[PDB]
């Protein structure tokens, strides 16, 4: 392998990650990256992910174990895996 | 109406729990003397218990009457297969735990919405505090209240087949008891202690003081031991029957370790799952109260 | 003072309580419960729920 081809090639790729979010004001936010990214893998074909995209704010918690029950209030499900 | 000399109902012959055995009719006590053990090193050693939540149910309005008695000992030690009780008029208990209401508890097992004529009923004081206790086992079920089916029945083994030089020291090794039998045996006796008039034990609990509680529990450690053994024989894994030369034994596989599912099936009495979630919410109420 | 089982006993007895049923509690018939179907089929969720 060159050691300048995945060090190029890995970047093209790297690049085109976008993951869907919202831009916050509140200084006491942290962005859930495990569950959000999850859906982008599917294509938010699922619900837990097609959650995600109607409301992308579903993923800003302040406070850890907050984040995942309120995507199961709003589901009705008893657990995602 | 009757009353309580502060020697309680259960210093009564109104009402007295007695198992049939022996082609005559036997005292607890003398039934108990029969179950001898072994060990087989697997320490059950004593947790703590947690405290009960305050929060009482609400008696959704009902009209009409539930024999709120019933139930109590359908479901512990309720013979006949019992489907799914997780649901049902099982909080009316509630509406007797308010200071002035109207609402009576009469003998025989039921509940009154108004006292009527002609039935004979227990102290409508001594009734408030069994109720601010015991009508918390209304939410058995709801999710976030249910108690835990497992560590209980570690204090369970630890009452009928503990002896006290084990149970000074919170720890005990493993028991499988074998008792003398005869035909129906393990079924037979919940046929007959479904008949019991539980509620005519209870009230005494949460009532009876220091003076009568010292000496209440003194009479009734055994009473208890009785309807604490069968309520056992329904968890245990195995039930097989040893085989003398004419005499049969029936030995129980582990009392004490609590397991998910009857070795009864056929041989003896069965629970479900709506039942496991009910049991552990008596056995941690009663427990408190006890010790 | 209580009941002795008469179901183990010998001698035959010739008259008990058998517990009966009234003309409201009938069983195994039928519910007019209806139907309603999901509408669209191409908007359904079966991947995870």
Same mark, same amino acid.
């Given at each position: 392998?060159?050691?300048?081809?995945?060090?190029?090639?890995?970047?093209?790729?790297?690049?085109?990650?976008?993951?869907?979010?919202?831009?916050?004001?509140?200084?006491?936010?942290?962005?859930?990256?495990?569950?959000? !990214?999850?859906?982008?893998? %599917?294509?938010? /074909?699922?619900?837990?992910?097609?959650?995600?995209? *109607?409301?992308?704010?579903?993923?800003?918690?302040?406070?850890?174990?907050?984040?995942?029950?309120? !995507?199961?209030?709003?589901? #009705?499900?008893?657990?995602?895996? | 109406?009757?009353?309580?000399?502060?020697?309680?109902?259960? @210093?009564?012959?109104?009402?007295?729990?007695?198992?049939?055995?022996?082609?005559?009719?036997?005292?607890?006590?003398? $039934?108990?003397?029969?179950?001898?053990?072994?060990?087989?090193? *697997?320490?059950?050693?004593?947790?703590?218990?947690? /405290?009960?939540?305050?929060?009482?149910?609400?008696?959704?309005?009902?009209?009409?009457? !539930?024999?709120?008695?019933?139930?109590?000992?359908?479901?512990? $030690? #309720?013979?006949?297969?019992?489907?799914?009780?997780?649901?049902?008029?099982?909080?009316?208990?509630?509406?007797?735990?308010?200071?002035? %209401?109207?609402?009576?508890?009469?003998? &025989? #097992?039921?509940?009154?919405?108004?006292?009527?004529?002609?039935?004979?009923?227990?102290?409508?004081?001594?009734?408030?505090?069994?109720?601010?206790?015991?009508?918390?086992?209304? *939410?058995?079920?709801?999710?976030?209240?249910?108690?835990?089916?497992?560590?209980?029945?570690?204090?369970? #083994?630890?009452?009928?087949?503990?002896?006290?030089?084990?149970?000074?020291?919170?720890?005990?090794?493993?028991?499988?008891?074998?008792?003398?039998?005869?035909?129906?045996?393990?079924?037979?006796?919940?046929? &007959?202690?479904? *008949?019991?008039?539980?509620?005519?034990?209870?009230?005494?609990?949460?009532?009876?003081?220091?003076?009568?509680?010292?000496?209440?529990? /003194?009479?009734?450690?055994?009473?208890?031991?009785?309807?604490?053994?069968?309520?056992?024989?329904?968890?245990?894994?195995?039930?097989?029957?040893?085989?003398?030369?004419?005499?049969?034994?029936?030995?129980?596989?582990?009392?004490?370790?609590?397991?998910?599912?009857?070795?009864?099936?056929?041989?003896?009495?069965?629970?479900?799952?709506?039942?496991?979630?009910?049991?552990?919410?008596?056995?941690?109420?009663?427990?408190?109260?006890?010790? | 003072?209580?009941?002795?089982?008469?179901?183990?006993?010998?001698?035959?007895?010739?008259?008990?309580?058998?517990?009966?049923?009234?003309?409201?509690?009938? @069983?195994?018939?039928?519910?007019?419960?209806?139907? !309603?179907?999901?509408?669209?089929?191409?908007?359904?969720?079966?991947?995870?729920?």
């Amino acid at each position: 392998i060159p050691a300048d081809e995945l060090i190029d090639n890995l970047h093209s790729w790297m690049r085109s990650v976008h993951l869907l979010h919202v831009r916050s004001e509140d200084n006491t936010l942290r962005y859930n990256w495990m569950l959000g !990214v999850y859906a982008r893998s %599917t294509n938010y /074909t699922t619900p837990v992910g097609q959650l995600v995209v *109607n409301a992308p704010a579903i993923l800003n918690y302040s406070n850890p174990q907050d984040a995942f029950n309120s !995507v199961f209030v709003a589901l #009705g499900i008893d657990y995602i895996d | 109406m009757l009353q309580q000399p502060t020697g309680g109902y259960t @210093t009564l012959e109104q009402f007295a729990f007695t198992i049939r055995n022996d082609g005559t009719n036997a005292t607890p006590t003398q $039934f108990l003397q029969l179950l001898s053990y072994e060990a087989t090193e *697997n320490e059950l050693v004593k947790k703590t218990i947690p /405290t009960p939540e305050t929060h009482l149910p609400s008696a959704r309005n009902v009209p009409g009457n !539930v024999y709120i008695e019933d139930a109590i000992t359908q479901a512990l $030690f #309720g013979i006949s297969a019992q489907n799914v009780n997780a649901h049902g008029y099982f909080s009316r208990l509630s509406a007797l735990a308010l200071p002035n %209401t109207s609402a009576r508890l009469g003998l &025989d #097992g039921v509940i009154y919405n108004s006292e009527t004529i002609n039935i004979p009923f227990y102290d409508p004081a001594a009734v408030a505090n069994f109720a601010a206790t015991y009508a918390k086992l209304g *939410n058995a079920s709801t999710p976030r209240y249910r108690a835990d089916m497992i560590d209980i029945y570690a204090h369970v #083994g630890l009452e009928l087949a503990g002896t006290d030089a084990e149970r000074a020291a919170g720890v005990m090794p493993v028991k499988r008891a074998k008792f003398d039998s005869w035909e129906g045996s393990l079924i037979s006796l919940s046929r &007959d202690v479904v *008949n019991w008039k539980i509620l005519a034990f209870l009230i005494d609990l949460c009532s009876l003081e220091g003076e009568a509680l010292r000496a209440f529990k /003194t009479r009734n450690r055994d009473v208890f031991r009785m309807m604490l053994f069968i309520m056992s024989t329904a968890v245990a894994a195995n039930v097989v029957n040893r085989k003398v030369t004419k005499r049969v034994d029936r030995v129980l596989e582990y009392i004490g370790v609590n397991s998910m599912r009857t070795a009864g099936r056929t041989a003896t009495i069965t629970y479900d799952l709506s039942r496991h979630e009910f049991a552990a919410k008596f056995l941690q109420l009663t427990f408190t109260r006890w010790n | 003072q209580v009941g002795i089982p008469k179901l183990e006993v010998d001698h035959i007895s010739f008259s008990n309580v058998v517990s009966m049923m009234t003309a409201n509690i009938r @069983t195994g018939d039928d519910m007019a419960v209806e139907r !309603v179907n999901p509408d669209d089929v191409r908007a359904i969720n079966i991947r995870n729920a």
